[PDB]
Amino acid sequence: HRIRITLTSRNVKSLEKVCADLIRGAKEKNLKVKGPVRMPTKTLRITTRKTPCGEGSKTWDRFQMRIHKRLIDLHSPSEIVKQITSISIEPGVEVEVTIA
Amino acid sequence: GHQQLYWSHPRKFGQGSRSCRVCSNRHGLIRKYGLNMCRQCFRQYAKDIGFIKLD
């Protein structure tokens, strides 16, 4: 019964919230809940010339799109967590809940 | 005769074979992460994709 709740966010304020609020509230229900596992950043680097044409000087952009991944370890059947999750949903994090 | 001689290029490789999703221009396609975007349009509309110059 290892539920593996994948938490991938573009933003930090929501990645902190969604991971914490599914533990902070899941302390009161007394189930053996673990802390959020970390994964390293992926900085999707697309470095484009600022100029549409090839004239002027060569001022390059450095477009940095960092993406992060967390998951939380559990000893729980599916329905127990589902009661907590869909209440208070925010746009940032992609919550992909694994059963196995 | 015309119809078979209308799409007779092998359209599976070359910058002419592929095309832009915004503008249908055959130069400066971002083929990293399959953005497949004319670099001039990427620059303008990367703000609402998520690409932001934080550094």
Binding site: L44, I67, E94 | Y33, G34, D48, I49, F51
Partner: peptide, 19 residues
């Protein structure tokens, strides 16, 4: 998903879809 689009591709596909 059967094609199984990547998580680098996800936020790009999330990005362009919005934009």
């Amino acid at each position: 998903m059967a094609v199984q689009i990547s998580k680098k591709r996800k936020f790009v596909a999330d990005g362009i879809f919005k934009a």
